[PDB]
Amino acid sequence: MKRVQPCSLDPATQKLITNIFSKEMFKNTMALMDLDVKKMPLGKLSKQQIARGFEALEALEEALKDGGQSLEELSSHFYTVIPHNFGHSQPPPINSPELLQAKKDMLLVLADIELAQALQAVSEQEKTVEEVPHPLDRDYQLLKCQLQLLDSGAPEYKVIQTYLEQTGSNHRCPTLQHIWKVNQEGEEDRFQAHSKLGNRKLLWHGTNMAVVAAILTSGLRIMPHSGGRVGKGIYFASENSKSAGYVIGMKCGAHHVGYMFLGEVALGREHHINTDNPSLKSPPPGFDSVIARGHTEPDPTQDTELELDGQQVVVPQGQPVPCPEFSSSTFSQSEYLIYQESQCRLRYLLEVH
Numbered sequence: 001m002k003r004v005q006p007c008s009l010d011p012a013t014q015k016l017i018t019n020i021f022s023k024e025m026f027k028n029t030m031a032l033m034d035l036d037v038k039k040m041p042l043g044k045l046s047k048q049q050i051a052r053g054f055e056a057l058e059a060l061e062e063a064l065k066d067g068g069q070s071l072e073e074l075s076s077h078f079y080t081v082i083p084h085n086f087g088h089s090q091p092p093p094i095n096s097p098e099l100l101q102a103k104k105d106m107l108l109v110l111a112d113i114e115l116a117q118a119l120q121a122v123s124e125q126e127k128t129v130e131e132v133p134h135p136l137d138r139d140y141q142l143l144k145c146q147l148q149l150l151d152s153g154a155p156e157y158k159v160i161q162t163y164l165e166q167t168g169s170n171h172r173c174p175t176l177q178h179i180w181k182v183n184q185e186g187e188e189d190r191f192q193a194h195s196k197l198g199n200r201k202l203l204w205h206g207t208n209m210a211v212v213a214a215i216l217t218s219g220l221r222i223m224p225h226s227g228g229r230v231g232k233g234i235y236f237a238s239e240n241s242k243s244a245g246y247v248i249g250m251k252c253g254a255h256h257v258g259y260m261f262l263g264e265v266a267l268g269r270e271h272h273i274n275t276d277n278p279s280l281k282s283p284p285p286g287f288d289s290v291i292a293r294g295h296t297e298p299d300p301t302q303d304t305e306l307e308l309d310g311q312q313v314v315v316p317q318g319q320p321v322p323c324p325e326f327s328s329s330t331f332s333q334s335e336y337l338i339y340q341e342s343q344c345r346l347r348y349l350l351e352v353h
C-alpha cells in the first residue's frame with residue numbers, strides 16, 4: 001500500500017482545487033449544456049469524439065454557406081457523435097450561424113473538460129513510485145501553475161477589490177472571497193518579448209468553472225472554431241459585469257461559487273470599432289489590438305497603475321460613465337481583443353459568491 005503524503009495547501013487553495021477538478025462540477029456543466037452524461041460519461045469523453053464533433057459542425061457550416069444532405073440530416077449526424085438530452089425527444093436542427101457558433105462554444109468547453117480528464121491520468125512513474133501526494137497536491141502540481149493566496153494587506157488587493165466593486169453589478173454585487181496571484185510557468189517568456197509594446201491593461205476574463213483547470217494549465221488560447229462579435233481572438237472586458245455574465249456560478253450550500261480571471265493585456269496600438277465584425281482574425285496592419293467600444297467605460301480619469309514585473313499596468317478604478325463618441329455603438333459595454341496568445345499573461349484568480 002502507498003503512503004498518502006499530507007496536503008501542503010492552505011484551506012482556500014484546497015477548496016479551489018477541489019472545485020475546479022470536481023467530477024460532479026464537470027457532469028453538472030455537461031448537464032447544463034443539455035449533454036447526455038449517461039451516453040457520454042466523463043471517462044469515455046475523448047479527443048477523437050470532439051474532433052468528429054467539430055467535423056460534423058463544419059459540414060453543417062458548408063451547408064449554411066448544392067444537392068448535399070439537408071441541415072436536419074447533417075444535424076442528426078452531429079447528435080449521433082455528441083449525444084444530447086432534451087428529455088429523450090428529437091434534438092433541434094442547427095440551421096443558423098447563431099446556433100452553429102453556440103454548438104462550437106459547447107464543444108470548446110467539452111474539449112477543456114476532456115483536457116482536465118486527460119491531465120489527471122496516472123503516469124507510469126506514479127504507478128512505480130511507492131508514495132503518493134495528497135490528491136489535492138497532485139492536482140495542483142499537474143496545473144504546472146503557481147497560485148499564491150493574497151491577504152487583505154497585499155499591495156494589489158485593494159486595487160483589485162475597487163476594480164471589482166466599481167465595475168461589477170450595482171445591485172447584484174459579486175462578493176469577493178479570495179484572490180490568488182497566478183504565475184503560469186511557460187507563459188512568462190512569450191509575454192516578456194512584448195516589453196517594448198506598452199498600453200498594458202489589467203482586464204476581466206470570465207468563464208465557467210469547467211474550463212478554469214485548462215486555463216491554469218494552458219493559459220488563454222485562440223482555439224480553432226472559436227469566434228464571436230469581434231472575431232477569432234481572446235475576449236476581455238474592463239467592466240466586471242460584462243465578464244460575470246459568462247460565470248454560471250455553481251450552487252454549494254446556501255450560496256453560489258464562481259471564478260474570474262484578471263489578465264495583463266499588452267494592447268499596444270489600439271484600433272477602435274463601434275460595429276460587430278465576426279470575420280476579424282487579427283487587428284488591421286500597424287495595430288496590436290481591436291477594442292469594440294461600448295456606450296460606457298469605467299471613468300478613465302479614475303484609472304490607477306500597478307507595477308507588475310517592472311512594467312506599468314493600467315487598472316481601472318472608476319464606475320462606468322457614458323462615452324459620447326460611442327453613444328451609437330452596437331456594443332453596450334467594451335470588448336478588448338488580442339489575436340496573439342503572447343499578448344496576455346494571467347495575473348489573478350478571484351473566487352466570488
Ligand SMILES: CC[C@@H](CO)NC(=O)CCc1nc2ccccc2c(=O)[nH]1
Nearest residue numbers: 105108205206207211235236237243246
Ligand atoms: C468558447 C466558450 C468559452 C470557452 O472557454 N469562452 C468563454 O467562456 C469566454 C467568454 C467570455 N467572453 C467574453 C466576451 C466579451 C467580453 C468578455 C468576455 C469574457 O470575459 N468571457
